[PDB]
Design a protein around this ligand. Structure first.
Ligand SMILES: [Ca+2]
Length: 142
């Protein structure tokens, strides 16, 4: 049996979340602590691709998101909101055959699960805006 993408994405989120309290450590090493053999070969490869992509483009991703936050900057957001946005933005921009609504709706689920009462609505709004202006043109043709 194969590990679902949703479970793979959750491991990526957990690594992002845990890193916020261990900023002197490597995001990639934190992901490996989370990954184990209960995940299949592809899921571990996929989670690594996501974490590497987010880590290697973090400043670009953060600055991209920052343009949609008026004066309540990214650093002032909760750990959950900030990282769901980072994860979803990476997916919208670099994971080619995933429809925009799948990325946004599955990101909202993570926000509702671990965030506060307005987390889901907040991230849905920001991601709708980011997707409209930053998703590759081909993604709209899916
Ligand atoms: Ca279609």
């Amino acid at each position: 049996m194969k590990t679902p993408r949703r479970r793979m994405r959750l491991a990526v989120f957990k690594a992002l979340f845990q890193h916020e309290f261990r900023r002197d450590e490597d995001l990639e090493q934190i992901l490996e602590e989370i990954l184990d053999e209960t995940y299949d070969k592809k899921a571990k490869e996929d989670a690594r691709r996501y974490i590497r992509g987010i880590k290697e483009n973090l400043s670009m991703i953060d600055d991209l998101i920052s343009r949609y936050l008026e004066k309540w900057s990214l650093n002032r957001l909760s750990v959950v909101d900030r990282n769901v946005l980072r994860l979803a933005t990476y997916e919208l921009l670099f994971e080619k055959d995933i429809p925009i609504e799948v990325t946004i709706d599955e990101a909202i689920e993570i926000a509702k699960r671990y965030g506060t009462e307005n987390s889901g609505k907040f991230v849905n709004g920001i991601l709708d805006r980011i997707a409209k202006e930053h998703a590759p043109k081909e993604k709209f043709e899916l």
